[PDB]
Every structure is written in C-alpha cells, then in structure tokens.
Amino acid sequence: EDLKDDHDPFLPEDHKKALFVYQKPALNNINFAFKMYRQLARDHPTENIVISPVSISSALALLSLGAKGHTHSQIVERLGYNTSEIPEQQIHESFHKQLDVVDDKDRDLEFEHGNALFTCKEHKIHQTFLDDAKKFYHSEVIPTDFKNTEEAKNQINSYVEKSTHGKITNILDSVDQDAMIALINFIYLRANWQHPFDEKLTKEGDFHVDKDTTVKVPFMRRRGIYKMAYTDDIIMVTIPYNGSVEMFLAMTKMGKLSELEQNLNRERSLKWREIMQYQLIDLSLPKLSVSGILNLKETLSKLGIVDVFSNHADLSGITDESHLKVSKAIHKAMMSFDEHGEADPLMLPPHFKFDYPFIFRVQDLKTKNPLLVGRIANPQK
Numbered sequence: 001e002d003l004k005d006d007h008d009p010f011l012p013e014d015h016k017k018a019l020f021v022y023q024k025p026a027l028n029n030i031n032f033a034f035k036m037y038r039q040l041a042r043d044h045p046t047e048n049i050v051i052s053p054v055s056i057s058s059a060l061a062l063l064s065l066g067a068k069g070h071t072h073s074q075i076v077e078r079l080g081y082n083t084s085e086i087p088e089q090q091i092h093e094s095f096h097k098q099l100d101v102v103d104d105k106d107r108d109l110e111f112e113h114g115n116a117l118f119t120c121k122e123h124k125i126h127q128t129f130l131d132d133a134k135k136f137y138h139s140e141v142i143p144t145d146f147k148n149t150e151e152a153k154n155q156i157n158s159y160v161e162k163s164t165h166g167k168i169t170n171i172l173d174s175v176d177q178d179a180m181i182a183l184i185n186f187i188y189l190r191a192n193w194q195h196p197f198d199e200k201l202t203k204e205g206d207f208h209v210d211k212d213t214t215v216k217v218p219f220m221r222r223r224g225i226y227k228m229a230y231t232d233d234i235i236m237v238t239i240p241y242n243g244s245v246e247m248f249l250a251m252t253k254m255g256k257l258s259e260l261e262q263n264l265n266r267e268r269s270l271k272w273r274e275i276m277q278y279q280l281i282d283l284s285l286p287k288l289s290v291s292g293i294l295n296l297k298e299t300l301s302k303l304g305i306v307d308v309f310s311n312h313a314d315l316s317g318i319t320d321e322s323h324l325k326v327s328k329a330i331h332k333a334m335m336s337f338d339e340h341g342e343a344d345p346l347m348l349p350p351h352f353k354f355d356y357p358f359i360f361r362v363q364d365l366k367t368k369n370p371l372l373v374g375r376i377a378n379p380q381k
C-alpha cells in the first residue's frame with residue numbers, strides 16, 4: 001500500500017441516502033396526482049398546465065367535512081383514501097400537518113397558498129363546519145351576495161390578491177347570480193434554488209413551442225452536479241430548492257411530450273429514480289412566470305367526484321339550505337423561475353437545456369406530497 005493518497009482523490013461525493021419512507025395519506029395524494037394530471041394533459045393538449053395536486057386534494061377533503069352520505073364517501077374514495085384503513089380524522093390531520101410544515105418559516109420556502117369558500121350571505125353556516133374549516137384547513141367561509149355579481153367578482157379577486165400579496169391578482173371573471181358556494185383555491189410558488197443562478201450568465205435563447213413556432217426567452221445557465229438521466233429521446237433532472245423541496249423536470253423531443261405524459265405513474269417514476277445518478281452537467285432553464293387556471297367542476301367530475309357539484313349534493317354539514325351545491329370551483333396556480341429565489345472540466349459536460357416543452361414536479365421532501373406539477377408549453381404564457 002504505497003499509494004500516493006490514503007483516499008481516492010478522484011472519487012466523487014457520496015450521495016447515498018436512506019430509503020424514502022411514505023405515509024399512506026401521501027401515497028394516496030401521489031397516486032391521485034398522477035391520475036388527475038394524465039387526464040388534464042389529455043383535455044388541455046397544447047397549453048401551459050400549473051396545478052397543485054395536494055392543494056386540490058386538501059380543498060376537497062375540506063368539502064367532505066361538510067358533506068354527508070354518498071356525497072361524503074365519494075369524495076373520500078375518489079381522492080384515493082380507504083376509510084377501512086385510515087380513520088377519517090387522520091385524513092384531516094394529515095392535510096393539517098401539510099399546512100403546518102409548509103408554513104413553518106424556519107423552513108426556507110416561498111410557497112404561498114390559500115383556500116376559501118364563498119357562500120350566500122342570507123344563509124347561516126353551521127358552526128361545526130366553521131370550526132373544522134379553520135382548525136384543520138386554515139380556511140375561511142366568507143358570506144357573499146351573488147345576486148350583485150360585480151361586487152363578488154371584485155371581492156373574491158381582492159381576497160385572492162390580499163392573501164397572495166398581489167402575486168395572484170385575478171382568479172374570477174364572472175359568477176352566476178344563482179351561485180350558492182364558490183370554492184376558490186390558489187397557489188404561488190417561486191423556485192428558491194439551493195444553488196442559485198448567476199444573472200451574468202443569463203442569455204436570450206430560443207424556446208421551441210412546436211415544430212414551427214419559436215419564441216425568445218431569457219435562459220439561466222449553471223454548471224453543477226445534479227441528479228439526472230438521459231437517453232436519445234428524453235432528459236430529466238432533479239433540482240433541489242432550499243427547505244427540503246426538490247423540483248423534477250423531464251423533456252422529450254418535439255411532439256413526444258404527450259407520449260410521456262400519458263405513461264406517467266408512480267411505479268415507472270420509481271424505476272427512473274434508480275436510473276438517475278448525480279452527474280456534472282450544464283443546466284439551462286428558461287426564466288419564467290407561468291399561470292394555470294382550472295375549472296375543478298369539469299376536471300373532478302371526470303375523476304368521479306360528481307355528487308358535490310350536482311343537484312342532489314348533500315352538503316347539510318355546511319348549511320341547511322335545501323339544494324345547496326358547489327356552483328363554482330376554481331384552482332389557479334402560478335410558478336416563477338428567476339436567478340436567486342472554477343477551472344474548466346476535462347470533458348465538456350452534457351448540456352441539459354430545457355428549450356422544448358417540458359413537465360415539472362415540485363415535491364415536499366418532508367411529507368412526499370406533490371406541491372405542484374404541470375407542463376411548460378410556452379414560457380410566454
């Protein structure tokens with residue numbers, strides 16, 4: 001052992017970690033995210049998609065607190081929960097914990113979230129629903145007058161503006177004068193890179209919207225070690241944020257993204273997780289500020305959640321109005337990419353440039369819940 005060094009000086013950093021342990025609520029929310037995104041990707045073929053699956057699941061679980069009978073059990077089941085395995089109050093506790101761990105400010109996270117139910121002023125909301133909506137979901141039930149449509153538009157939008165600190169200024173264009181309950185759910189996420197980008201290295205480049213459409217956007221560029229994988233047909237990278245959150249990105253050749261989106265599930269995700277390795281790469285990301293607005297009635301109905309939006313909804317846990325139903329259900333999510341949320345290598349590293357339509361997934365590493373997923377089809381909205 002006449003070795004020049006007592007340890008191999010070329011060996012890269014060790015990156016082993018313990019096995020990801022999952023709680024059953026997180027697994028249900030993860031599988032619901034896949035189911036919902038695949039359908040959304042079918043129904044909106046060309047646009048940007050930005051949704052928070054855990055926040056949609058949370059809003060419906062809150063709605064189930066005010067539901068009874070088949071209306072209640074259908075929501076719980078279609079969210080992926082089996083009440084023969086999980087007591088119902090552990091579901092509400094799990095969504096409560098997710099709010100607390102994200103709102104923990106010793107955690108460095110720029111994740112603003114909000115959920116509110118706007119109801120008719122002339123009807124009294126049950127106190128037990130008011131109590132649990134505030135306790136478990138930090139959600140307000142706000143009286144409104146929908147017969148005067150224009151004040152509700154300004155009021156709902158101003159509420160969203162206030163709770164997002166002006167980041168989401170508009171969520172509702174108009175509301176029917178016969179509305180009973182309006183579910184309003186919104187998310188803003190700014191990527192707070194664990195390793196920020198240098199603004200000096202940001203350059204304008206081509207983003208290819210489709211086989212014949214190209215737009216000019218600023219591209220951030222950084223050289224570093226990232227967990228990655230690539231073939232001739234796909235590249236994928238995991239980018240850590242601060243505060244125990246990681247963003248996964250995947251990109252295919254032009255026009256093949258749909259083939260990827262319609263094949264996503266957890267089992268295939270875990271297989272790719274084992275293939276990916278930490279490698280030195282050049283990473284190019286478009287500067288970006290993209291929005292997605294979701295009509296939750298049409299989307300959730302295709303997923304089997306129908307009663308709560310129907311003329312036979314049993315929402316007597318909220319109010320004793322005869323035919324109370326959720327008339328409007330909106331989910332708006334915003335995501336922003338900016339810069340701040342050395343000798344030459346022997347070989348030029350592979351350049352992971354995301355200048356083609358790509359999909360993204362933001363995951364809370366403490367809970368494993370999907371905080372945000374979607375598709376960047378055009379970083380210019």
Ligand SMILES: C=CC1=C(C)/C(=C/c2[nH]c(/C=C3N=C(/C=C4\NC(=O)C(C)=C4C=C)C(C)=C\3CCC(=O)O)c(CCC(=O)O)c2C)NC1=O
Nearest residue numbers: 033034037238263264265268269272273359360361373374
């Ligand atoms: C068929 C190919 C296929 C690929 C390439 C794939 C990749 C993939 N998905 C993952 C996780 C994940 N992927 C998602 C979800 C999504 N992923 C998205 O990019 C989008 C838009 C969604 C939409 C719902 C979720 C929820 C996880 C976490 C799964 C878990 O931790 O159990 C990971 C792990 C990332 C990491 O550990 O750092 C990879 C590699 N998934 C697949 O099924």
